[PDB]
Write a protein that binds this ligand. Structure first.
Ligand SMILES: *[C@@H]1O[C@H](CO)[C@@H](O)[C@H](O)[C@H]1NC(C)=O
Length: 181
């Protein structure tokens, strides 16, 4: 298997709006997570259920990459069992979450009008997506203008959620060293 398509996911011209986040299936690859933790580009790299350090030793049966665009202020909501407009009405990470979250501040590039759900009748189920714009005829989706000139807690920020499972089925996405190194 050839190397894992991270640059094609990460350095794409556009990231989705967060209410319409997008999944990607990754398999048959040899993953190189080295790019992340650049400390001058990746401002947040935090794993749940495994050690970011232990990613280099592990093989995964299925890896999905959920992607979207929010503000710096709201990055902290992408965590198991957190509360917020994002976690309650946009993108929900399970309580039993296994995976990583990577986030970096693309403010000078991902500029424009992006959207987010502010209100919903019920909160969200884990990993559920709601692409509806109305409830009773009112727009249920409020707007972000991302600009270079807004303060940091308010700036554009791209997020990726690598969600994997270590159960049965052929082991398909293997770190550079799943041969006991
Ligand atoms: C880390 O980020 C900087 C940002 O300018 C980039 O130049 C560099 O190539 C990245 N990583 C490496 C492998 O040096």
């Amino acid at each position: 298997t050839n190397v894992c398509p991270f640059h094609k996911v990460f350095n794409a011209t556009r990231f989705p709006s967060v209410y319409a986040w997008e999944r990607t299936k990754i398999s048959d690859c040899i993953a190189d997570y080295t790019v992340f933790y650049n400390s001058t580009s990746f401002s947040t790299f935090k794993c749940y259920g495994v050690s970011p350090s232990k990613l280099i030793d592990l093989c995964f049966t299925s890896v999905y990459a959920d992607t979207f665009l929010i503000r710096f202020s709201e990055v902290r909501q992408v965590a198991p069992g957190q509360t917020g407009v994002i976690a309650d009405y946009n993108y929900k990470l399970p309580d039993d979450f296994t995976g990583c979250v990577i986030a970096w501040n693309t403010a000078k590039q991902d500029t424009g009008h992006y959207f987010y759900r502010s209100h919903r009748s019920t909160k969200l189920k884990p990993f559920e997506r709601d692409l509806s714009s109305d409830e009773n005829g009112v727009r249920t989706l409020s707007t972000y203008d991302f600009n270079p000139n807004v303060p940091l807690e308010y700036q554009a920020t791209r997020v990726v959620v690598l969600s994997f499972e270590l159960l049965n089925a052929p082991a398909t996405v293997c770190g550079h060293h799943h041969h006991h190194h």
